[PDB]
Design a protein around this ligand. Sequence first.
Ligand code: NA
Ligand code: NA
Lengths: 419, 420
Amino acid sequence: QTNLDFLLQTDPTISGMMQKELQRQREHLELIASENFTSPAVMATQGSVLTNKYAEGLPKKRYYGGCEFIDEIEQVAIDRAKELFGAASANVQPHSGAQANFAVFLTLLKPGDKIMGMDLSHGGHLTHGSPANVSGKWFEAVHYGVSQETEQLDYDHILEVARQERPKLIICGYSAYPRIINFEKFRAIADEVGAYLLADIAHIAGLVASGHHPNPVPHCDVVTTTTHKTLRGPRGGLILTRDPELGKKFNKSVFPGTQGGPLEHVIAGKAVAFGEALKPEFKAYSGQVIANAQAMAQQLQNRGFKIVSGGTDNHLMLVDLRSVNLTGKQADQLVSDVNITANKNTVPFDPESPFVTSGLRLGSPAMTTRGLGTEDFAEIANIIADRLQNPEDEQVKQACVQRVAALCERFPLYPHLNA
Amino acid sequence: QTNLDFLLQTDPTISGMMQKELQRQREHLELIASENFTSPAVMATQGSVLTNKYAEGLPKKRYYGGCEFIDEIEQVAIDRAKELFGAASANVQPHSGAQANFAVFLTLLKPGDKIMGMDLSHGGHLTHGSPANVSGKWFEAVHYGVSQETEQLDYDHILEVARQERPKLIICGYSAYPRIINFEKFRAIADEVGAYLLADIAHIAGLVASGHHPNPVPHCDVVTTTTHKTLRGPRGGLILTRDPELGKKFNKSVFPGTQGGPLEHVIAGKAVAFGEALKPEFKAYSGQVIANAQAMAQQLQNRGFKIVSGGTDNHLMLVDLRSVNLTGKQADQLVSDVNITANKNTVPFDPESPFVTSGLRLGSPAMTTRGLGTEDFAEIANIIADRLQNPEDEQVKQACVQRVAALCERFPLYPHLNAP
Ligand code: NA
Ligand code: NA
């Protein structure tokens, strides 16, 4: 008898909904740029008895008895993180990217200090100073955005904003930014104004780890990330720093500063994900992720769609829909009708509200994990274009549904589960 | 081929360590009061593909596409939590008890406001105002403690402290308090001074759910909890309230106020655990948890040990070593030497450093889940007392080891789990 058997027997309601989610993942193009398909080995750790252990503290320095094997696992996670990112220090306990960022704020700032991040509507994250988040509620948040002429960062402009605002912390790393970030220029800016510098590399962490994006670790005071976007791990957070003394302060801000017990089953999954990312295959995967995103962006452009900034150098893109006279909300609905899963997103300088938007955010990591290549991503672009150009045409609709089904059949997902 | 097979094949290092942890859980008396053994069904949800879904927002009100099935699961979790605790609102997204508490603080307080909680050394939690936690760093946290005479709360004294300090938020619910909490009296106190009232029922949530401890939901502005202590769920948090308008504000403080994406695999596990807690067997389990803790406390007292407050009304106890020639750190080590897992713990009025302590915290939930009864808990007390009374005696040590092994063999843990 298996744990899944017990679930079916004791809670058929939840068992059936979970099986429907597996089928959903199998039968949609999962183009949400922040999603991935984590490995069977990672899922095994998350389904383990490690959930039962209280392990407040750090390896060998715990507030609870019984942590001998949890300590071995968490130290492997730390050591593999330091290896994978070339970092002198790593804390693998943050529950999420948001909680990683907050522990950094607790270390470096006090309430009322000034933080500078990218405007939420230009691709910054809610935890980088949004009024609805603690970062904008308890701190003075100021913003920079992208240039209207390029739709990407203008570093001289960022320097001028920094000089005018004199923030205590500058944040770089974003949620919808398709170009390479120059961490050396951010360090030059931070040094000129005397600010701390955080890189939140959540989206791009797998590309950083594999050498397909510049590395912030030697340049920034601290690097935070999720483990679950391009890094393809379990859902959670991570704090890295080049300064090992500062890293000890970040440890104290994770626990007891902001969290209680760590999720040790998730931390075992982090160890597994970092081990996978250290293999040559992960570098090839990350290169394919970028090639696939570029193939999709280019074919969307061939079909008449505007890509914000004119292309991408990473795994994601924003489609600016003002051309096909659709909002992002409308386009997201229209692609969902043909079994394509994405999310709407404001574009820089968007005339629509954040509840409507002019953009659709698409990314390649999840379908690249399923094995799709560049020609398959050009086919995805053509399905999207066909649907959005002919939203009333039922025969185009069915052709799109069928072409999605063919892609899903060609590239099975977790075929050993509930076959 | 299973996910566990993939783990053994691709990461034998982690696979082996994880196996060792299963064996460790099987072969020790797990007396950590805040631990439990969650069910196979809960573990199945946590090991599922639900980890792949981004689901910021709320059911039917998401910022990501594709949430149709996640929305059904999270709404089942919400609905079962509301039924289980009699709450008008529930948010099942907090990643932990600490994060549930922080979302409450973000809703009710601004930095610099005054909060009042139990002193850490008297069993309050770090998130209730410790200066090492955001709660005491960015808020002015004042404290109350237990009576020196009874070693439990004196509600008239708490009232006097509240009248003098005029806190904006009073926090009740604790990490090492063995007696029933009177939430009606805490409400009377909060009302006298105009404070909000939070109950953090992390430790006792399963006893509340089963009717074996008074329910704070009708009396407090908000109730937070962990899902993984006496509630026996996956590791995570939960916010409950009697006031649905406050509930809407707590939702916004969880997301986008405090967190990003929720852990929907864990939330499916919360749904499963709440469904288990709604069944009559859970009520019987919770009554056994208390009877077992009481039996262990009573037999420790029969052996000459002191229990803070003179006994327990719930699942936990502190052995008070202030008058014994061992520290809490040593007592924890000595029981670990005979395969008993606990934690050292500060006692009220402890003369010792928090790195040393004069207490040992013990609880019944995890071994009650394995099937032990009151006579078995009396036996646990006698094993502990034998070891602590004779710390250097090697024959007693080996007898203790054998007696622990006998209990572990008689009451197996997850017997269906094999090696890959
Ligand atoms: Na502000
Ligand atoms: Na002592």
